[model samples]
Target: SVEVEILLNDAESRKRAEHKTEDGKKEKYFLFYDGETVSGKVSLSLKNPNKRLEHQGIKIEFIGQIELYYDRGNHHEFVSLVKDLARPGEITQSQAFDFEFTHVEKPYESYTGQNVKLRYFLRATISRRLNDVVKEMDIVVHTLSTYPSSIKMEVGIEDCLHIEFEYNKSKYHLKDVIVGKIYFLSVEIKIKHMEIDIIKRETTGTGPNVYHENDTIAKYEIMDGAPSSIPIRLFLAGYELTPTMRDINKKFSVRYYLNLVLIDEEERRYFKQQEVVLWRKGD
Candidate 1:
């Protein structure tokens, strides 16, 4: 007999982005940053407008929580705020309540990964004797923050082989391209194929109780089809990537690795992984 809906003020003028939920639905989300005020309104309406809805208080809560998909009930809540909207009252029609948080210290950006997800949302509740009425609305936060230099490395297999690799930059925007070149100095081993893979390694928990997850996002092949050095072009927009996060809330961290793979004729492969910082510049 009750219906609730949440709406953000000035929402039409805010920048928006798409967030994919766990249920495989792409939801429309607003882009916000740290130290930003989030203000919204929640309206509670009745199915039977003539019937009186009575004896309850209304409240709204702002929450930032992290959940590991493997552990469903165990949620880590970081930021929490509660706003009481109304006292015990009765309403036969629509009643709307406005809620606001000024310059809320949202330190961590909202992220949805393979095994875990970090989120920010507002929950509205109506106190009742039976089952409390609840409604929740989600928002996305992206932190603003960095820099330069190239990558040059050499991998040597003692007296067997020597290979050199160079990347245009070590730090890159998520939508940017990675320009690299490969040069084989000397080769005594039979190398079948070479490839570069984007790996997102996640770190969760801490100390000895920690868990690590490695996901290979994309891989591009590199054949020996060159005169001097083989140039590599990798467009990052084609891949799903989250900007790098460091020691986020002392709970989890997300990092990226550029892996150079060399597979020989013996079905064995060698790896050279380079840590790279990824950030978002536009959109």
Candidate 2:
């Protein structure tokens, strides 16, 4: 288990993230993916430390790099974005501020790799805020890999009435939030074998673009004396949310492919998908 230690800048008045709970006090948050981000305020220290670089101050950057080491044998840089700087001698107390890299923008590139396995890592650099000074402060940057881009999902029902599910977003970094939208690729549902044999596919159009609905793409047929409930599930993919103006409930009909047969032991298929709205507070 990795242990996290709370650090304080040598300043007497600056407050840490955990101790900045004053009434109507403004708090800053750094890039905390799951719970790890190199944070803490700067303090005025008079120690005789030659190796440590003196302060004009530091700029904390929330960086993200997508790696492709196996099939391609080379990594591609997606995008690099930075946040506002915190002056070294400016901040007084120990209150923690976020490395708000949310303003950083990135492009979406589909995964097209044949890698059998993969790995991830992060790095941070803290340099002296001066050009004349030849000293550089090296502080280890902490990266939290809680959102796993690649995951394994499986679904099965024994009695046909109850089910269990699990999804791992472990590879997703804190910087990925810069993207405008997040999406959930719902599981493929085949119900022709069950009692519900009617499939009605619909699309929600925004101006000229159209999207599909996965839930109603297809339906299953049921036996006269057989079970009524057919259990289905899928490990959904994540998507970024972008600002748009469209009718929330408006629906348009999409393509509906029909099939009449039992799915093979491990046959993979695709279908139309829909968006599920999640309400937020204090918007």
Candidate 3:
């Protein structure tokens, strides 16, 4: 016989949208509204607390779910539902893994019904040789960050300058986990040249430990004969921008800001500003 302890420890979700090229055309790639990451700790302490054993990594099964409700202004109705697993066989059991996702773009619209409810779960199991039984543990994902954006601009007139698109996440606490991306929708001015900097800071100093960026369109014309609308779509991948205790203060919420910039090649300078929000999840 074996004594087991299993409970749903934690659960949570986030949202995001990506832009990719398909057959030479730019398109939007949205993530499942209920998409999430579920993880937790597991102890293999024996009944005597002194026994030891050798074995492969524990086996974990993840089940991600979604339930949608649709509102037609007067009445709401159930639309659809879905579930999936991160892996079929194991939790932390691999010397190395080169895994890929099944669907490139998950459905976001279908996940939101009359009210949006996004959640994820993880189930783990371990087989003990001492008693020839299986041990299990369950944990739910949690919310980390909600919205995030970043932008860069390039212009050429008489002078040149540059601005950075960075956000301060040290002010707010962890409220909800959000997976999001910054889209390069339309430029409002003449575009002589453009560049992006997805730099990762190492210390609080000026330089960064890692710096990399994708040059979507180096030099291009204003969209639609004007600068109002552009056809080029660019975006960064989503990540868990987790919040901490220091950021969870009543005085100021942890704010992550994005910067949109204009560069002037004539004078070797650029001008940029923080991005504004278009949509968000309702609490």
Candidate 4:
């Protein structure tokens, strides 16, 4: 009966990326920041030139929510806003209305994990009898822009091994390359091999209902010889890694870490793990 479209302000001028949908589809989304104003133009029209959309009001809403697939019934909404574009009016001519949501106070980043989804979108609805003419568009909301400080850690295995490690940044985006170097200061034990692994760790549920899940997203091989000053350049885009999410809805969280492991002939393994933050940047 009617046609509705959502056109975000500066969407074409701003950066855009593809968001993976629940149906295993990638949907395009514009970049937005938390606490930033989200203003857009909502256009309405009729499919037929002679026909008119009547007997109902037009509405717009800004919503941020988290949905768990297993439950599939409850929506944990953190931000909900509304604007009455057209109220109880009949329309024969096509029209456009502007909706603005200032300082939306969004706290969670957009995510679609194994069993959960947290997102932000704009909903345009023309309330009617049997069903409503609803149109929703997803948007990605960013919260953190870390300092990008270089992280350095020293690992010592008593008399066995002592080494220094450094990485370019403590924070990175999805496709960014990891630039770092590893140095073996001293070693007495003959290690079989060495490698670096990226691990994705998820913390779901609340206290007293905690569930922990982990996956090794990527791994890089290293050398064993002494005076080993290995320069690391690990490409993250090679593996499908979910963006890091933390304290989402106070129920679920996702984080990433870099782990370095050294193995000996006795089949004994030694390792060190360092946590890092991951985000999605503009195009």
Per-model TM-score, in order, reads: 0.93, 0.24, 0.25, 0.78
Summing lDDT over every window of 10 consecutive residues in candidate 3, give the lowest-scoring window: 198-207
Over the stretch 76-173, how does candidate 3's per-residue lDDT look in tens digits? 22222222222334323223221122332222222211122222323344444443345433122333335533233433333322222233231223
Top candidate on TM-score is 1
lDDT of 1 by residue, 46-119 (tens): 98978988758988988899887667588889989889998988767887998898977788878887677899
Whole-model lDDT per candidate: 0.83, 0.28, 0.30, 0.81
Return the lDDT, model 2, position 19.
11
* Candidate 1 Cα errors over 4 Å, as ranges: 206-208, 224-227
Worst 10 residues of 2 by lDDT: 109-118
Give one digit per residue, the lDDT tens place, for model 2 in 166-198: 223322221221111112122233323322222
Question: In what order do the candidates fall by lDDT, top score first?
Answer: 1, 4, 3, 2
**Candidate 2 residue 53 C-alpha distance from true site, Å:** 3.6
Evaluated at residue 9, the lDDT of candidate 4 is 86
Clashes by residue pair, model 4: none
Better of 2 and 3 by lDDT: 3
Off by over 4 Å in 4: 23-25, 144-192, 206-208, 223-229, 235-244, 266-271, 279-283
Q: What's the true lDDT of residue 159 in model 1?
A: 80
